[PDB]
Amino acid sequence: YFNINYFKDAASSGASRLD
Amino acid sequence: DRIMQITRGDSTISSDDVANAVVGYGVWPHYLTPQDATAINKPTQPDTSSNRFYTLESKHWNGSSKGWWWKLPDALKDMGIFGENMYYHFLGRSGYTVHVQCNASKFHQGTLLVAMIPEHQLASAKHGSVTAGYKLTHPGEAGRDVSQERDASLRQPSDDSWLNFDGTLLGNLLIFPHQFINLRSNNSATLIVPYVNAVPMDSMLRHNNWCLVIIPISPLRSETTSSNIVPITVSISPMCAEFSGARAKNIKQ
């Protein structure tokens, strides 16, 4: 389960990723 | 066939009679792998000169005997080379071979239970939170118990057998790698055991990984002259010894 930005804005999202 | 031959150093042992041999947890002792490792230095691996067949101090098997133990990383704190490399290095790792010899005649009756035990945290003989002392879980070739007497001032373990010294009904002890010495068939007991521990190489001084126990189950019974003494002799062989973390040298105690 993931990438389901339930919210529109980007500022709202999980902790980013890593690379 | 029962006969067995074993060659470890410059040393060899024979036995014209035996009860197979046992490999602890069905794993054969070997050297550490660059996968499970952690340290960074090149381990010194004395071959032969170290992992050879050292024989300890012998003992008497009494009708009053109660049992005796030796703690391995420790039993050879004096056995040349191995037992020096122990003291010169921080990290030590090694597996063993235990040859337990105890003969008498076919007119004798007796039974010895031999067992090795990973992390054998003994219990103190005294109620409380006081743990057994160093100096007493570090006997040496000589081993411990016999059925002996001692200061109760010392944070002294349990000389108590039936509870396993750890307080587990001996008899379930059969869960640890073992075998007996039923004087009517047997002659020896042979345990072989790899290196078991949550760490790739531990402190040969602070931590004793293997603990060995020999316990008279059915009491020795002859009809001979008590001039006839039936010792019990233990022989051991570090195998795939590996050391590292070289430096000054600890100190004897």
């Binding site: - | 009860a19 743990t131 587990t168 640890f176 047997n186 949550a198 004793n208 600890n250």
Partner: protein, 283 residues
């Protein structure tokens, strides 16, 4: 997989074939147990068996259904005070990370030398009303690894958890639960140990030189209330994704203290579960 896993038929036991009589040389019933090995004899060997297709799974006989069950391992208690709030060492709990502090489950592991696992963890706060109204009693649990500022008292600076974990539970909202990685510098958790702190004839020896893994300093955030209370936040623990190495004989003597084996009761003779018989002849 499903069916086998839903029907729970993953680890099935063999069936009992049919036998006939044997007036033959090799005697399987005879082996010498001194070899330390275990016999291999079966029904089919000893008797004239029939034919039973089995259907018993050894699923529930897995270190995960043996271990993977939540158990009280600690009961944090706070007999609040309103007289002196804050003060040193008050109204906030702290407790050393471990299991041996409470039986039944301690028992259970100890069945093995080494163990490894991710732990579930659940908190069951229960608010006893000693007043005529408990209000809104918020709560803060958190975890203090070594070496870390452990709250001296109730509002330190450590309850800011700028980089620590603090779970918050407010009366009504359900039980707090969460989980955790396997925390050990070692490849496995040492249930036992035959090591010491050092050569100091006064050094420590046990499971314990190897387990200073925390502590928990607690807190009831809400401030001063009128009508008193007492909080009892129960700490349950579950082992998920477990492994075990080198089984041991179970414990038969009621322990005392943790991180030790010591049984030697205060005076009372050492008692065990074994029962006494009048005679071996009749059971």
């Amino acid at each position: 997989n499903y069916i086998d896993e839903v029907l729970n038929e993953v680890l099935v036991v063999p069936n009992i074939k049919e036998s006939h009589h044997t007036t033959s040389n090799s005697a399987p019933l005879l082996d010498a147990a001194e070899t330390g090995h275990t016999s291999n004899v079966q029904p089919e060997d000893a008797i004239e068996t029939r034919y039973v297709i089995t259907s018993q799974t050894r699923d529930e006989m897995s270190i995960e259904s043996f271990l993977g069950r939540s158990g009280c391992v600690h009961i944090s208690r706070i007999k609040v005070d309103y007289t002196d709030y804050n003060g040193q060492d008050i109204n906030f709990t702290k407790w050393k990370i471990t299991l041996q502090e409470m039986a039944q489950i301690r028992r259970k592991f100890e069945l093995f030398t080494y163990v490894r696992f991710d732990s579930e963890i659940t908190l069951v706060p229960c608010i006893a009303g000693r007043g005529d109204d408990i209000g809104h009693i918020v709560m803060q649990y958190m975890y203090v690894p070594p070496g870390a500022p452990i709250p001296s008292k109730r509002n330190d600076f450590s309850w800011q958890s700028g980089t620590n974990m603090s779970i918050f539970w407010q009366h009504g909202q359900p039980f707090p639960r969460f989980s955790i990685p396997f925390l050990s510098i070692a490849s496995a958790y040492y249930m036992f140990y035959d090591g010491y702190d050092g050569d100091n004839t006064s050094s420590k020896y046990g499971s314990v030189v190897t387990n200073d893994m925390g502590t928990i300093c607690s807190r009831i955030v809400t401030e001063k209330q009128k009508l008193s209370v007492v909080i009892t936040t129960h700490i349950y623990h579950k082992a998920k994704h477990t492994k075990a190495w080198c089984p041991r004989p179970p414990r038969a003597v009621p322990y005392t203290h943790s991180h030790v084996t010591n049984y030697m009761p205060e005076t009372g003779d050492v008692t065990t579960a074994i029962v006494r018989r009048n005679t071996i002849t009749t059971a």
